[PDB]
Ligand SMILES: C[C@@H]1[C@H]([C@H](C(=O)O)[C@@H](C)O)N=C(C(=O)O)[C@H]1S[C@@H]1CN[C@H](CNS(N)(=O)=O)C1
Ligand code: NA
Ligand code: NA
Ligand code: NA
Ligand code: NA
Ligand code: NA
Ligand code: NA
Ligand code: NA
C-alpha cells in the first residue's frame with residue numbers, strides 16, 4: 001500500500017468508484033455525459049489511476065474535471081499526467097492553484113523545507129468555498145478545508161443506486177505536520193485554519209467518507225467487510241466527525257508538545 005502501488009478499482013456506491021493506488025485515494029464519479037476524477041495520486045501513480053479508470057469501463061477522454069484536495073506530491077503528483085491524458089480542467093482552492101501549476105509548495109506550508117516537488121499541471125482554475133461544480137447530472141460541492149495547505153478543498157456529492165442515495169465526502173487531509181524547524185504555536189493563521197476545518201468537516205452531511213489517505217477511514221477493513229456485507233460497509237455517518245476529531249487530537253497533541 002505504497003503511494004504508487006497498483007490497486008484493483010472498485011465501486012463504493014452507485015457511480016462513485018475508487019480508482020486510486022494502494023496508498024492514496026482517487027475517485028471517479030461517473031455519468032453518461034462524462035466523469036469527474038478526484039485527485040491524481042503520485043506521478044507514477046497516474047499510470048495506475050488511468051488503467052483503473054479504463055478497468056471500470058470508462059474512457060479517459062470522457063473525464064472532464066480533475067478535482068484537487070491539496071497540492072502535495074502524494075495526492076497531486078499525478079494530476080499533470082492525468083490532465084494530459086484526459087484534457088480535463090483541474091479545479092482547486094485558490095491558494096493552491098500556483099502550486100499545482102509549478103509543482104512547488106510555498107514557504108507558508110508547514111512542511112516547507114521537507115516536501116518534494118512534483119510535475120506542474122496545465123489548465124488549473126480556482127473554485128471558492130461552497131461553489132458547485134456541474135457536469136451533466138453530476139453536482140459536486142467544494143468546501144474550503146485549509147490548514148494542512150492553504151487551498152485545501154473537501155469535495156461532496158450524492159450517489160444513488162435505483163434511487164437510494166447517500167451523501168459522499170472526499171475528505172482532504174486535516175493533519176498538522178511540519179518540518180523540524182516549524183512551530184505551529186508561531187503561526188496563528190494555520191492553527192485557525194485547521195480549527196475552522198475540523199468544525200466544517202464534523203458538520204458535513206456524511207454517509208460515506210473517502211479520506212485522501214484511505215486508511216484514515218479504514219478503507220481496507222471496510223472493503224474486506226464489504227465482500228460479505230455489501231457496500232453498506234463503506235457507510236458510517238460518523239466518519240467525518242471521526243476524521244475531524246483525529247485532526248483536532250493531532251493538533252492539540254502538537255501544541256502541547258510545543259509548550
Ligand atoms: C506526512 C503525511 C503524508 C505525506 C508524507 O508521508 O510525507 C506528506 C507529503 O504530507 N501525508 C499526510 C496527509 O495527511 O496528507 C501526512 S499524515 C498521513 C495519514 N496517515 C498516512 C500514513 N500513516 S497510517 N497508514 O498509519 O495512516 C500519512
Ligand atoms: Na491498479
Ligand atoms: Na498537464
Ligand atoms: Na484544492
Ligand atoms: Na499551496
Ligand atoms: Na494552469
Ligand atoms: Na501540515
Ligand atoms: Na472512522
Ligand SMILES: [Zn+2]
Pocket residue numbers: 070072148173
Ligand atoms: Zn499533504
Ligand SMILES: [Zn+2]
Pocket residue numbers: 072074075173213
Ligand atoms: Zn498526504
